[PDB]
Design a protein around this ligand. Structure first.
Ligand SMILES: CO[C@H]1O[C@H](CO)[C@@H](O)[C@H](O)[C@@H]1O
Length: 158
């Protein structure tokens, strides 16, 4: 089991960490969602589906910088929504193919009433998402840590 980003940054068997740089809608109004869909930038696969089933969760998601201060967050994982920053590990998604499958994580971030102006700074860390991989074969319990950075400013109109 291993993962890679859209630009080819890899985290190999056994886990590790990587940086993911995301383009963000440049203007987001109070009452609207800023959507950060990581399923277009993070992909994983099972290296031995003949014998092993891999299990993959969002173990935790943490907010940083302007996302922590200026947004009210929800994370959608494989079709279900939960609070973000997260309050529990999600259910498991099965990985059972050698063909890359997206990691089905999306953040939905809506501005808090106090938000206004440059609510997310370009280049800043906005989230850390911990992907936890286990299986039905051995005791493997690995963390794939995704540090998510904004590529651009996000302005909340006032
Ligand atoms: C040792 O086998 C590797 O590949 C299998 C199948 O993906 C994983 O379950 C396991 O944790 C390792 O990453």
């Amino acid at each position: 089991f291993a993962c890679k980003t859209a630009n080819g940054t890899a985290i190999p068997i056994g886990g590790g960490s990587a940086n993911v740089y995301v383009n963000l809608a440049p203007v987001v109004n109070v009452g609207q969602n800023l959507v950060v869909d990581l399923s277009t930038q993070i992909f994983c696969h099972n290296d031995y589906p003949e014998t092993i089933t891999d299990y993959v969760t969002l173990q935790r998601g943490s907010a940083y910088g302007g996302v922590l201060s200026n947004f009210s967050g929800t994370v959608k994982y494989s079709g279900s929504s939960y609070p973000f920053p997260t309050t529990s590990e999600t259910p498991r998604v099965v990985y059972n193919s050698r063909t890359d499958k997206p990691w089905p994580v999306a953040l939905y971030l809506t501005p808090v009433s106090s938000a206004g102006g440059v609510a997310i700074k370009a280049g800043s860390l906005i989230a850390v998402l911990i992907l936890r991989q286990t299986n039905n074969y051995n005791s493997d319990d690995f963390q794939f840590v995704w540090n998510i950075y904004a590529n651009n400013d996000v302005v909340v109109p006032t």
